[PDB]
Design a protein around this ligand. Structure first.
Ligand code: BK1
Length: 459
């Protein structure tokens, strides 16, 4: 049983198929990351014979560019996958902060990805959902190793149709995955898409929304027409052509991609080639990452608002039931029990126990002196209306990051892109914008953008 060995320490974030918690071995103090997969929410593809067997194989494999899996647990409601924690964050979030970026830098990155992929394919493990989000760093530095996360998961679990879960996925998926017949070569395609983005800052198959992108992927046509491709070697372009070859049997293997002249030439420890900064690509990749992260932040903000509405209602009912006097005022002990009851009531909560500190932090705000009893109505507000901070601050941070010129505003064209990626219908967000500000002249500030998101989630 998972809880016998590990204690949750803090939430790392939401990943594919479930939340990721930083945990600690109760005996040895070893830190690890655990992915908790809800058996209710997430459908299984294969039998458990197959799932257990793949897990046992993964436990025996080791490669410096693949996330290390340590252990597997299960209960009636969840799977717990335990593995090594990496603290360097996502690759692209590191790249966007660089001032210089060359073909050499791109080559070093892609060689690591290809090395990990080659090793997993040798063991008949396919990723299928390879994308920048699945490339973590061991530290936030251009010199740190890349670790690929989520190999093998898509073989055993079905992806949700929820847009917050499938935002940003269309750019990287192989055409043959869309049509249903795929094998390990799909991972070479996704890596080719990533390389194309590193060298130009723009996806080869681009579009305003999921459908537009997938239509371009399926046709399979892409070009080096953009001006910034003049700064890129023909050798790099040749590798991209081989990796983005449409028919998978004609597409280069990960193993042979590692032997390609570009990889061999540009990953030399000693730089012997020209290294002009791909400056336009850096500007573009910042814009790309920025747009992707703001769209993700927006959907997570709307989700968290809905969740807070539900929890506000459930928490007030709980305290009302506890309030036998009917005076609306409870003490510290009662408030903690009620909050703990809420976290059980909504079964889909994080693995954490964070209530008592939360309670004391709320009480500090509501009644610093701790004279006695607390208006539980006041507590609920401060408990919920502050607990949304994580998503509210993340939304603002994503807005600021996106606004690279510090204009304080997002244009209608940018809104079209952001909402298109977010699966918000054109007429719908324009209608809401009109409701928020009649005299808007094709741009919103942060508050207006926030107001739009609230109207888009029934608030
Ligand atoms: C971005 C943040 C949500 N995150 N995500 C991971 C991946 C991860 C963590 C724990 C168990 C896993 C099991 C199977 C596949 C991936 C797993 C991860 C990590 N390893 N380290 C740090 N942060 C991580």
């Amino acid at each position: 049983i998972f809880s016998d060995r590990y204690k949750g320490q803090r939430v790392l974030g939401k990943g594919s198929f479930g939340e990721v918690i930083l945990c600690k071995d109760k005996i040895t103090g070893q830190e690890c990351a655990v992915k908790v997969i809800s058996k209710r929410q997430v459908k299984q593809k294969t039998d458990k014979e197959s799932l257990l067997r793949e897990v046992q194989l993964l436990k025996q494999l080791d490669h410096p560019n693949i996330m290390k899996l340590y252990e597997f647990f299960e209960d009636k409601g969840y799977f717990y996958l335990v593995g090594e924690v990496y603290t360097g964050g996502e690759l692209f979030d590191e790249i966007i902060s660089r001032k210089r970026f060359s073909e050499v830098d791109a080559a070093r990155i892609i060689r690591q990805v290809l090395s990990g992929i080659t090793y997993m394919h040798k063991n008949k493990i396919v990723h299928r959902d390879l994308k920048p989000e699945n490339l973590l760093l061991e530290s936030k530095s251009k010199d740190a190793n890349i670790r690929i996360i989520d190999f093998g998961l898509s073989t055993h679990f079905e992806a949700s149709k929820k847009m917050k879960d499938k935002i940003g996925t269309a750019y990287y998926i192989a055409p043959e995955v869309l049509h249903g017949t795929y094998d390990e070569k799909c991972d070479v395609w996704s890596t080719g898409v990533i390389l194309y983005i590193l060298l130009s800052g723009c996806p080869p198959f681009n579009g305003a929304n999921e459908y537009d992108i997938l239509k371009k992927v399926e046709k399979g046509k892409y070009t080096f027409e953009l001006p910034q491709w003049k700064k890129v070697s023909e050798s790099a372009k040749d590798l991209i052509r081989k990796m983005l070859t449409y028919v998978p049997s004609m597409r280069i293997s990960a193993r042979d991609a590692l032997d390609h002249e570009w990889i061999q030439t540009y990953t030399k420890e000693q730089i012997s080639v020209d290294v002009p900064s791909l400056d336009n690509a850096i500007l573009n990749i910042r814009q790309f990452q920025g747009t992707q992260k703001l769209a993700q932040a927006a959907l997570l903000y709307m989700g968290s608002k809905l969740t807070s509405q539900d929890e506000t209602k459930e928490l007030t009912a709980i305290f009302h039931k506890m309030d036998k006097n009917g005076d609306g005022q409870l003490d510290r002990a009662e408030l903690i029990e009620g909050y703990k009851e809420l976290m059980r009531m909504k079964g889909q909560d994080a693995s954490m126990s964070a209530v008592e500190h939360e309670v004391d932090q709320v009480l500090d705000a509501v009644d610093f002196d701790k004279n006695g009893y607390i208006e539980y109505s006041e507590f609920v507000t401060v408990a919920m209306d502050r607990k949304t901070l994580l998503s509210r601050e993340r939304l603002e941070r994503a807005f600021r990051m996106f606004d690279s010129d510090n204009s304080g505003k997002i244009s209608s064209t940018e809104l079209a892109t952001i909402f298109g990626v977010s699966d918000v219908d054109s007429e719908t967000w324009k209608s809401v914008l009109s409701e928020v500000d009649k005299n808007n002249d094709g741009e919103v500030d942060f508050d207006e953008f926030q107001q739009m998101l609230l109207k888009l989630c029934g608030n």
